[PDB]
Design a protein around this ligand. Structure first.
Ligand code: NA
Ligand SMILES: [Zn+2]
Length: 303
């Protein structure tokens, strides 16, 4: 069951997908498993929908593991999924959120990459799409979105780990999300979960121009990082992608924000570089716990 599932170890794709099935079997009135598309290599792409009912009500999007090597993110997503089912009807604030909004949680946004990080290359970042006139494989799915696509902050080289692909939305992993979010039509928050560096970022990455909601999003981010820090003292910086991490084009939250999804943020989880991508499994639960407080804070503001 999801009660005896080990949340304190890193899991395989099959184990995470199996976890989804268990959670849905245990909580059919709250959680459903949606298939939003197929990966390049033909693996199902799964989103968990958390809903108390209503008619096409406003929604929160959360993607994790778009960059496959960032194992702390998929691990945090599994923890999140369980947490939602525990806290609904128990925590007044989360109850209020799920009473007015649906949450769509995509734990493994890049399943081909995730498989590849277990089988061949632990540090694999990109998708696994074949590039026609190249010996190199894959596209950076977080450089592939239709928001300043192909501008500075991505590579045009197929062998680069920040290769943007031939055109915006070329990667089915990205197109599946775009289609789903657009078809739904009523997303109010869009949160992309990455690692590492302990940052909470808002748009833009592709341009130095500040967003018109900078004051509000900056305050939300400030509040969220203070909530996060309250648990273990984990210090996060916050600000726009471009001013806080680097210039990056074709990124997810730049796209989502441009769709009018005001509360668009990217988390960069633990750590700052001591362990980096190879954050030990004993850090999964404390990371997920503190990150939850930050995410909940954003959800409260979206509410
Ligand atoms: Na795997
Ligand atoms: Zn990333």
């Amino acid at each position: 069951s999801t009660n005896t599932f080990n949340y304190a170890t890193y899991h395989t794709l099959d184990e995470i997908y199996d976890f989804m099935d268990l959670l849905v079997a245990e909580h059919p009135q709250l959680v459903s498993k949606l298939q939003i598309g197929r990966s390049y290599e033909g693996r199902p792409i799964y989103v968990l929908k958390f809903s108390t009912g209503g008619s096409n009500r406003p929604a929160i999007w959360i993607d994790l593991g778009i960059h496959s090597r960032e194992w702390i993110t998929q691990a945090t997503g599994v923890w999140f999924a369980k947490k939602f089912t525990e806290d609904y009807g128990q925590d007044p604030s989360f109850t209020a959120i799920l009473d007015s909004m649906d949450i769509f949680l995509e734990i493994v946004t890049n399943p081909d990459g995730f498989a590849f990080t277990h089988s061949q290359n632990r540090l694999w970042r990109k998708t696994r799409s074949v590039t026609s006139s190249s010996l190199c494989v894959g596209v950076d799915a977080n450089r592939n979105w239709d928001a300043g696509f192909g501008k500075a902050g991505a590579s045009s080289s197929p062998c680069s780990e920040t290769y943007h692909g031939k055109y915006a939305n070329s990667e089915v992993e990205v197109k599946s999300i775009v289609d789903f979010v657009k078809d739904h039509g009523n997303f109010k928050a869009f949160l992309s979960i990455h690692s590492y560096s302990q940052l909470l970022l808002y748009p833009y990455g592709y341009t130095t121009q500040s967003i018109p909601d900078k004051t509000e999003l900056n305050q939300v981010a400030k509040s969220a990082v203070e909530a996060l820090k309250s648990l273990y003292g984990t210090s996060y910086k916050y600000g726009s992608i471009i001013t806080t991490i680097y210039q990056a084009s074709g990124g997810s939250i730049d796209w989502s924000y441009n769709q009018g999804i005001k509360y668009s943020f990217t988390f960069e989880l633990r750590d700052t570089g001591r362990y980096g991508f190879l954050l030990p499994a004993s850090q999964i639960i404390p990371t997920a716990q503190e990150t939850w407080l930050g995410v909940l804070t954003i959800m409260e503001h979206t509410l």
